[PDB]
Amino acid sequence: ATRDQLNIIVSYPPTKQLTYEEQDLVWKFRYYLTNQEKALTKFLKCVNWDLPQEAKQALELLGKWKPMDVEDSLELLSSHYTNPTVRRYAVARLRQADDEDLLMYLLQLVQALKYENFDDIKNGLEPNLEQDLCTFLISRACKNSTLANYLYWYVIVECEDQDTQQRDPKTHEMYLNVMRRFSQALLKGDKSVRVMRSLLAAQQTFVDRLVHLMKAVQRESGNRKKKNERLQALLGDNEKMNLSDVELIPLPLEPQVKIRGIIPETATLFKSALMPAQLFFKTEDGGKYPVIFKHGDDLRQDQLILQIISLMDKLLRKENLDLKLTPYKVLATSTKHGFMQFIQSVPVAEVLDTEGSIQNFFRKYAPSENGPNGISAEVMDTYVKSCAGYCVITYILGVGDRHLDNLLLTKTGKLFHIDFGYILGRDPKPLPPPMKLNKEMVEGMGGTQSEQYQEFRKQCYTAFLHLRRYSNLILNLFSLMVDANIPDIALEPDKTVKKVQDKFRLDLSDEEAVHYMQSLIDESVHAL
């Protein structure tokens, strides 16, 4: 009875509002819940922090409480929590995460600095619970150069944000101070952390030079061939432009990769409105890392989606489920330019135009006499899995504007999506289908009577059930994004988390969730 009503409350997603009745029920049993880590955030929610005596008692219980997971602590950094001791406790729990996990949350943690104390951040500038979020991140960045790289670029983009600057100067000034504190901590560090500062400086001037080059190509008119030759000439002039021969600097898009420079003679522009450049970076070890450099575009919505897809890919792998996804790197180097990792691939629309069908494509580049449908069993297994993975992930994220030009394919059988300009349920058309599945994908795996389609359906159920188990973490991260300058979030900041929460159907048992996902696929198929 009373015990059952608590377990329902405790198991709520982190963003659901407890009723008055629910809050006072949680309070009454506060002492009966101290060994349930998943109930601590529910308790903290129901505390009148206004009242000193109750706040005292609440902090006592926070001390005696079974410590909460790192994933749940992310909730305490959101805008709904202002008590300093609660926010310092969140940081203390975050300290238990290793750097691989921390890096996967970094984009959101940088947004959460909006919810920190701005005076503390400023006051740390030279003219257990002892660390706020800013001090924590700078401290972790000074020990890991990959963390430092992303901290720098994440904060630098929030600094240049002209909407924030005009519309919320206090928050813009905080991010300047965050960057000033970072620089200060780097200069006070040992030779290791001190050289990191100049590596960051070298990356920044390289991007400025690249930005300047893109503009130079576009100064006068010319056709694409003429513009490529301008691009190539300017890149090869290293005295002038200095982009083809640099001292092994980290690549911002992926700082583990050290770059000697851009290869001048293989750089070209894409045929599109913004004419982003395809650029091959020379690696310290003689290899090539292809990127797209975009100028005149805000990559931050793409950056968020690819960060989330990367996270979901890792969660699934943690569960021994590798769906062959393609979480390509995206890094905004400004609100107006950025990098994307280039993946060798071909749009499905071009597959249909040239080979007539996904199956024909596979039979041309990966045949197998005894393989399924004459296709390499290895390639077919890669295609079924990546279809299942992307069907579930784009459903959960409500990605829209899906067509055969932003569905991409590799000769190894990987299918993946690109261009996430429409998310969280926005779409150019009204009444879009909930499962982003089409007739070309289903024919690609042999149609709906095939063993592959069965496998695809099962991989969809598995993926959905696993990601459901991580709904708290995923909902928490999204709740740190509700004030970000990301267009599809800023449209309805107060409905964003709910939009993602609903997709998990946390109201269904696992048994029921699998039936639902089965009907989602069949109904989408029946409609195709």
Q: Which residues bind K ion (CB under 5 A)?
A: 145, 149, 196, 199, 250
- Are 250 and 257 within 8 A, CB to CB? yes
- Report, in Å, the least distance between residue 84 CB and Cl ion: 5
34 contact choice in K ion, Cl ion, none (CB below 5 to 8 Å, kind-dependent): none
CB neighbours of residue 320 within 10 Å: 7
- Among residue numbers 415 through 454, which ones bind Cl ion (CB under 5 A)? none
282 contact choice in Cl ion, K ion, none (CB below 5 to 8 Å, kind-dependent): none
Degrees to nearest 5, angle at CA 85 with 110 and 304: 20
22 contact choice in K ion, Cl ion, none (CB below 5 to 8 Å, kind-dependent): none
Q: Would you say 2 or 19 has its CB closer to Cl ion?
A: 19
Spatial separation of the C-alpha atoms in residues 279 and 282, rounded to whole Å? 10
As to burial, measured by CB atoms within 10 angstroms (0-12 exposed, 13-18 middle, 19+ buried), residue 432 is: middle
Closest residue to Cl ion using C-beta atoms: 53
- Are 257 and 281 within 8 A, CB to CB? yes
- Are 250 and 203 within 8 A, CB to CB? yes
Residue appearing with tokens 């980290």: 250
304: which 2 tokens?
């968020």
Rg (CA), the chain: 25
CA end-to-end span of the chain: 47
Size of the site for Cl ion (CB under 5 A): 10
Residue 504, sorted as left (phi over 0), alpha (psi -120 to 50) or beta, turns out to be alpha
Spatial separation of the C-alpha atoms in residues 361 and 410, rounded to whole Å? 10
Tell me the window of 62-70, 129-137, 158-166, 258-266 that interacts with Cl ion (CB under 5 A): 129-137
Q: Does 123 bind Cl ion (CB under 5 A)?
A: no
Instruction: Identify the H or E element spanning 157.
Output: helix 145-159
75 contact choice in K ion, Cl ion, none (CB below 5 to 8 Å, kind-dependent): none
Please pick, from the candidates 17, 19, 223, 320, the single residue that binds Cl ion as defined by CB under 5 A.
19
Q: Would you say 121 or 214 has its CB closer to Cl ion?
A: 121
- Report, in Å, the least distance between residue 195 CB and Cl ion: 19
Q: Would you say 86 or 246 has its CB closer to Cl ion?
A: 86
Q: Does 21 bind Cl ion (CB under 5 A)?
A: yes
Q: Would you say 36 or 171 has its CB closer to Cl ion?
A: 171
**3-state class (DSSP) for residue 311:** helix
- Report, in Å, the least distance between residue 148 CB and K ion: 5
- Report, in Å, the least distance between residue 238 CB and K ion: 23
- Are 434 and 460 within 8 A, CB to CB? no
Give bridge partners of residue 415 from the DSSP assignment: 409
Q: Would you say 132 or 488 has its CB closer to Cl ion?
A: 132
Q: Would you say 20 or 31 has its CB closer to Cl ion?
A: 20
CB neighbours of residue 48 within 10 Å: 12
Q: Would you say 99 or 173 has its CB closer to Cl ion?
A: 99
Binding mask 34-63 for Cl ion (x = CB under 5 A): -----------------x-x----------
87 contact choice in Cl ion, K ion, none (CB below 5 to 8 Å, kind-dependent): Cl ion
Contacts of 65 (CB under 8 A, 6+ apart): 34, 37, 40, 43
Q: Would you say 76 or 331 has its CB closer to Cl ion?
A: 76
Q: Does 181 bind Cl ion (CB under 5 A)?
A: no
For residue 77, which phi and psi values (nearest 5 degrees)? -90, -5
- Report, in Å, the least distance between residue 197 CB and K ion: 9
- Among residue numbers 132 through 151, which ones bind Cl ion (CB under 5 A)? 132
196 contact choice in Cl ion, K ion, none (CB below 5 to 8 Å, kind-dependent): K ion
Q: Does 87 bind Cl ion (CB under 5 A)?
A: yes
Taking the CA atoms of 450, 452, 455 and 457 in sequence, report the sign of the dihedral they define.
Answer: negative
145 contact choice in K ion, Cl ion, none (CB below 5 to 8 Å, kind-dependent): K ion
Residue appearing with tokens 């709910």: 498
Q: Does 99 bind Cl ion (CB under 5 A)?
A: yes
Please pick, from the candidates 1, 3, 8, 20, the single residue that binds Cl ion as defined by CB under 5 A.
20
Spatial separation of the C-alpha atoms in residues 463 and 119, rounded to whole Å? 44
Q: Would you say 132 or 313 has its CB closer to Cl ion?
A: 132
Q: Would you say 244 or 386 has its CB closer to K ion?
A: 386
Contacts of 28 (CB under 8 A, 6+ apart): none
Q: Give the residues lining the site for Cl ion (CB under 5 A).
A: 19-21, 51, 53, 87, 99, 116-117, 132
